[PDB]
Design a protein around this ligand. Structure first.
Ligand SMILES: CC(=O)Nc1cccc2nonc12
Length: 460
């Protein structure tokens, strides 16, 4: 039975509005309703992995697992295995997998982050799951961010706290936050970004939604605008939105948006908005294709509609050679040539690099680079041809070309990372000097760039 080189992943996000679900929620897992929907011819074909995020979830873990497993069994006739379940307050993530994947999945991690202080600490935050699927690391974040049209900056702060403090994936990757630890990272939830139009325009917005004319609404979506101004979710992707706003509905129909201020809303308007989202970030030159992104039309117990997204995701096999794992393979090498980091920092410490990759036995520290002044004020750290030659565990190009090198640039004075990035070894040529580039981030904000050349030797 061969190991897969592609899997499909279902991501669901639903704010349940503290109400039990209806008896049938199969439309969700089938990607049926509005938006980019799944072809009917696929309905019996199970996804490899189903990741369900809920918010305002009133059920016990047991209650929801029974509904989910029985739902998938009805669709697919497959009894899914529970990989992980983790709940913070009423925020929950469930990971289910086809039974054939049970002995491909390992290194399962769960964590949560509570956002805010005092007043603002007590119901918002995130849960997450990570695991290995053969040679591929997968991370999943379900976040319920701060509500309210006038709190987009709070949401952005919530995002940064979650990606700093959620402790998933390989702890040996110590300079790296979750936005660098995974081949594929999916971040979804009730992100709570709103359509930023005047309150007086509520009926106009509703009109536009009834005509399926979303362009003038999406141009005011706070998540799209904040992302475009690099305020949040830097280097993440989102499929185009082609479904109606998923909030705020009257319960038990989808015919009415309930937007007017009420005691129950703290006298806040809830103009129709795309609160409920799925974004991802994959390592450079790894296959990831969104095959659906939409909302259900027939699940009406909540003031939110469920959102689905499905993905094709490239995976790799757990590679064994006569040499690595357990030793280096002298027919392999990675050389970084004429490299320099451009940093936004005003500080004047020396810097060194760390190279982290599961193709190395352990991480590699460089010598200190040479600081020069950039023409427009910048710090440029020059490494020249001084960088250590990296010794991969496996030289076979079918393995090595599928790998990635994480780079941290660290202060000699503090050993703190000033920037993190990632370089793909999926090169156009071996034994050939080729340009490389990554942006550098720290706490998910841009701090600089790393560029230079690479020369990769494989056994072929
Ligand atoms: C510990 C647990 O609850 N579940 C699992 C552990 C390891 C692999 C699995 N594959 O499916 N479910 C899995």
């Amino acid at each position: 039975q061969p190991e897969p080189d592609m899997i499909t992943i279902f991501i669901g996000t639903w704010n349940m509005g503290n109400a039990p679900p209806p008896k049938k929620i199969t439309s969700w897992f089938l990607s049926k309703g509005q938006g980019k929907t799944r072809d009917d011819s696929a309905d019996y074909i199970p996804h490899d992995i189903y990741v369900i995020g809920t918010q305002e979830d009133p059920l016990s873990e047991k209650e929801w697992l029974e509904i989910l497993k029985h739902s998938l069994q009805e669709i697919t006739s497959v009894t899914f295995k529970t990989v992980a379940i983790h709940t913070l307050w009423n925020i929950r993530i469930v990971v289910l997998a086809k039974p054939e994947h049970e002995n491909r999945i390992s290194h399962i991690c769960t964590d949560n982050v509570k956002t805010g202080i005092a007043n603002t600490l007590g119901n918002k935050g995130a849960v997450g799951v990570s695991f290995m699927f053969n040679g591929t690391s997968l991370g999943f974040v379900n976040s319920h961010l701060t509500s309210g049209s006038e709190k987009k900056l709070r949401r952005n702060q919530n995002y940064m706290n979650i990606l700093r403090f959620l402790a998933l994936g390989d702890k040996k990757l110590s300079p790296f936050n979750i936005t660098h630890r995974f081949t594929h990272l999916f971040w979804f939830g009730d992100l709570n970004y709103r359509v930023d139009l005047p309150t007086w325009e509520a009926e106009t917005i509703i009109q536009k939604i009834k005509q399926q004319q979303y362009a003038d609404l999406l141009s005011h979506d706070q998540l799209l605008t904040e992302r475009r101004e690099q305020k949040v979710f830097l280097h993440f992707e989102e499929e185009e939105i082609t479904f109606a706003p998923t909030y705020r509905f009257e319960r038990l129909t989808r015919d009415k948006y309930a937007y007017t201020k009420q005691k129950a809303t703290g006298m806040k308007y809830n103009l129709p908005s795309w609160c409920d989202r799925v974004l991802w970030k994959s390592y450079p030159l790894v296959h990831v294709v969104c095959q659906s992104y939409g909302s259900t039309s027939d699940i009406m117990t909540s003031d939110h509609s469920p959102v689905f997204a499905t993905f094709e995701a490239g995976v790799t096999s757990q590679f064994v050679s006569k040499n690595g794992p357990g030793t280096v393979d002298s027919q392999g090498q990675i050389e970084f040539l004429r490299c320099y980091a451009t940093l936004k920092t005003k500080s004047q410490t020396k810097f060194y690099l760390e190279f982290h990759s599961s193709c190395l036995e352990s991480f590699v520290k460089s010598q200190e680079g040479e600081n020069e002044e950039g023409s427009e004020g910048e710090l440029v750290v020059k490494f020249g041809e001084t960088l250590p030659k990296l010794k991969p565990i496996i030289s076979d190009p079918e393995y090595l070309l599928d790998q990635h090198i994480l780079i941290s640039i660290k202060s000699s004075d503090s050993d703190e990372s000033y920037g993190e990035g990632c370089i793909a070894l999926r090169l156009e040529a071996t034994e050939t000097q080729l340009p490389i580039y990554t942006p550098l981030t720290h706490h998910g904000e841009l701090t600089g760039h790393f560029q230079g050349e690479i020369k990769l030797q494989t056994s072929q």
